């Protein structure tokens, strides 16, 4: 059953998320304006959006029970590789299957296939990204399960450059073991049916999206003229 430590972990992850994911999207107004007409018209806006989101994923990561015991180098390595994946994951909260789009509180901040395609990335990425959103949405995870997945996603021992992988793994196992248990005791059937395997599969899907995103990035960032529309954080994290 759910020990005191496990319930503690869940409380912590839920609060960390609440402090890093603003469901009112009030800060979106600070980003460079969106332009829907396309010569990468949406890049300035979405670049700022992603950059802001990187900062928020970092804030979340810091509060993951045990993340503080890793070294600075491992922390950087885990976030550098997981950022994009976690942003894709946290975005499921604004993604609606009614019109297949990310509804972030208002018309201007409601992005669909065509908006998200006006930023230097091709359908090689976008199609698989939406499909992911749809399937994740169809798992109807408890918010508890959502935050445990993002946490598990960040602390993955097989990320490129990880050093003390044994520690990364131990930390993850604790979260992973908390999740498997939460499903068994808090998620009733049939929704619980192979829910864990389904959630882990999504982690593999993210790896695939991550890989494709990298290629799309090297490409977009090949023309210095385009690397200009990005932010310093994005360049450092994704590639400068």
């Amino acid at each position: 059953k759910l020990s005191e430590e496990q319930q503690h972990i869940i409380a912590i992850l839920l609060d960390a998320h609440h402090k890093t994911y603003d469901p009112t999207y009030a800060d979106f107004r600070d980003f460079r304006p969106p332009v829907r007409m396309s010569p990468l018209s949406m890049l300035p806006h979405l670049a700022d959006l992603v950059s802001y989101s990187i900062q928020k994923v970092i804030g979340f990561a810091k509060m993951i029970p045990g993340f503080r015991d890793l070294t600075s180098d491992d922390q950087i390595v885990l976030l550098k590789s997981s950022a994009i994946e976690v942003i894709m994951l946290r975005s499921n909260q604004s993604f609606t299957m009614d019109d297949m789009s990310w509804d972030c509180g208002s018309q201007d901040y409601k992005y669909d296939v065509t908006d998200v395609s006006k930023a230097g990335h091709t359908l090689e990425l976008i199609e698989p990204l939406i499909k992911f959103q749809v399937g994740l949405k169809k798992l109807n995870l408890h918010e508890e399960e959502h935050v445990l997945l993002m946490a598990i996603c960040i602390v993955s021992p097989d990320r490129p450059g990880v050093q003390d992988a044994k520690l990364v793994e131990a930390i993850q196992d604790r979260l992973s073991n908390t999740l498997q248990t939460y499903i068994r005791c808090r998620h009733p059937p049939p929704g619980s049916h192979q829910l864990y395997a389904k959630m882990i599969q999504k982690l593999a899907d993210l790896r695939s999206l991550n890989e494709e995103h990298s290629k799309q990035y090297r490409s977009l960032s090949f023309q210095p003229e385009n690397s200009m529309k990005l932010t310093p954080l994005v360049l450092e994290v994704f590639g400068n």
């Binding site: 810091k62 922390q75 950087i76 550098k80 310093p232 954080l233 450092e236 994290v237």
Partner: peptide, 11 residues
């Protein structure tokens, strides 16, 4: 590989 910003945000 020297990520000043990432490093500073994680501190």
């Amino acid at each position: 590989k020297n990520h000043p910003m990432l490093m500073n945000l994680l501190k």
